[PDB]
From Swiss-Prot, chain B:
Enzyme Commission (EC) number: 4.4.1.21
Gene behind this protein: luxS
Gene Ontology cellular-component terms listed: cytosol
Record's subunit section: Homodimer.
Species the sequence originates in: Haemophilus influenzae (strain ATCC 51907 / DSM 11121 / KW20 / Rd)
Residues the record lists as binding Fe cation: 52, 56, 126
RNA-binding keyword on record: no
UniProt-recorded name of the protein: S-ribosylhomocysteine lyase
One Gene Ontology molecular-function label: S-ribosylhomocysteine lyase activity
């Protein structure tokens, strides 16, 4: 039933941006959900601590590069399969705009030099404060920068 | 900066529902993001495989119980901290309605008897088809049902400096 079950994962490129779905609010406003695929499904996977550290940094940097007059990010969360993130937002930016904000966000991640520099890693502001790894996050960022970010279109991912 | 960082996790009850934020689209439609907290922060945590299996089931069951004329779920995803899920949707249901749909979804999870019974767990429909544990998901569901779903309100979670 779920939309992610209707797309062929063996045909996905990664790192890559895919518009998962678009929705219209009652009054006619647009909501878009993006599949930010970091890893090749079933060939690569992010570590639990790395994806957690990346989530903190990424949810902040993506908002820095993407929020504006026509865009308001609703939520950015890691996928259970740990091969990427889902980003939902008010607005209708295309894959290119999203991929360029993602790329700049990876450079930003690399700019975060030490874990001790991340303020919110304590029992008051984080749910599992010791479940972190800036090193894994740095490694993921460098890998995305080195591989480049492509695009996946639902039309080319049909399942029979 | 992030909203999640402005609330005191040491004061949160779990399992519990919290309205993390409400937003207005340009035309004035409502969007609500819910923090479905399964675990007491920094005391309990969900397993990586268990939260993955739970994600599949929960995302489907919550939509069955909540989607209707004035509610449309945008996304339901696990938190990096593995202590819960964030659910974003078009609409304005309150904590009680969400908690009841959640509780019902837990019973639904218990109704999924064998992992081999879950269709989408393959290389075509899932990104990490082997990273699953129906056992952990059942354990999580029973735990939630046994403990009951409370409510956390942003007002009671104020954080000093
Ligand atoms: C602060 S970690 C990310 C929390 C939430 N998923 C957000 O997009 O803000
Ligand atoms: C792979 S389970 C589906 C998860 C996705 N975030 C959804 O809300 O449908
Ligand atoms: Zn955290
Ligand atoms: Zn999956």
């Amino acid at each position: 039933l779920l939309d992610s079950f209707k797309v062929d994962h063996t045909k996905m490129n990664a790192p890559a941006v895919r518009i998962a779905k678009t929705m219209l609010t009652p009054k006619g406003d647009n909501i878009t959900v993006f599949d930010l695929r970091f890893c090749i499904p079933n060939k690569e996977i992010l570590s639990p601590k790395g994806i957690h550290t990346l989530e903190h940094l990424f949810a902040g940097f993506m908002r820095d590069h993407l929020n504006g007059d026509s865009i308001e990010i609703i939520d950015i969360s890691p996928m259970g399969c740990r091969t990427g993130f889902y980003m939902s937002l008010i607005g209708t930016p295309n894959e290119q705009k999203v991929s360029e904000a993602w790329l700049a966000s990876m450079q930003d991640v690399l700019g975060v030099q030490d874990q001790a520099s991340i303020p919110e890693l304590n029992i008051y502001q984080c749910g599992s404060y010791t479940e972190h790894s800036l090193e894994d996050a740095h490694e993921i960022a460098k890998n995305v920068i080195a591989r480049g970010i492509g695009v996946n279109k639902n039309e080319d991912l049909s399942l029979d």
